[PDB]
Design a protein around this ligand. Structure first.
Ligand SMILES: O=C(Nc1cccc2c1[nH]c1ncnc(NN3CCCC3=O)c12)NC1CC1
Ligand SMILES: [Cl-]
Length: 167
């Protein structure tokens, strides 16, 4: 039993809710919140901009030190950093950005990072400003992640479409 509330169960291990991931994280304080990161951990907009804003820019300060030490992430890769006031940990995961021409095939590799964590609160990778089809992202999530994932979808119309079209 965990404290995630109001989710629709899609499969044995995938759950979904129309919710603002920032408000979900603040309420639940999950062990792991996933950020929709880019390779430079520049948290300017989308989910990343919202999560970072909620940390009063502490996420960005920590991220800049991480990049200065380690260099950029790979598309499809991840790193574990602090969850600040939102979670114990933040798993920064880089899905491909279609608006940069990045290979959508890397979306499966991106979701594989979730399997290193027993339970996660997460957005749909490569959705939103990353330009992929959220229906495809949900399918890859279900077919790749084996650990327990609680998906927060900000847009109500999109959420209803994701549920109604789910196979
Ligand atoms: O500004 C925010 N939040 C916020 C800002 C921008 C985007 C999101 C967001 N929260 C989200 N939660 C889940 N997914 C998101 N984005 N995507 C990615 C793929 C489908 C989708 O809808 C966002 N919060 C402040 C008011 C307290
Ligand atoms: Cl977005």
């Amino acid at each position: 039993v965990n404290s995630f509330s109001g989710y629709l169960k899609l499969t044995d291990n995938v759950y979904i809710k129309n919710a603002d991931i920032v408000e979900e994280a603040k309420k639940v304080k999950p062990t792991v919140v996933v950020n929709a990161a880019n390779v430079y951990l520049k948290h300017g907009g989308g989910v990343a901009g919202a999560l970072n804003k909620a940390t009063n820019n502490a996420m960005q300060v920590e991220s800049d030190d991480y990049i200065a030490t380690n260099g950029p992430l790979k598309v499809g890769g991840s790193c574990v950093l602090s969850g600040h006031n939102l979670a114990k940990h933040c798993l920064h995961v880089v899905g491909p950005n279609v608006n940069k021409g990045e290979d959508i095939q890397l979306l499966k590799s991106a979701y594989e990072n979730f399997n290193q964590h027993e339970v996660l609160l997460a957005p749909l990778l490569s959705a939103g400003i990353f330009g992929a089809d959220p229906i495809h992202s949900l399918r890859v999530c279900v077919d790749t992640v084996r650990t327990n994932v609680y998906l927060a979808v900000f847009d109500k119309n999109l959420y209803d479409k994701l549920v109604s079209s789910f196979l």
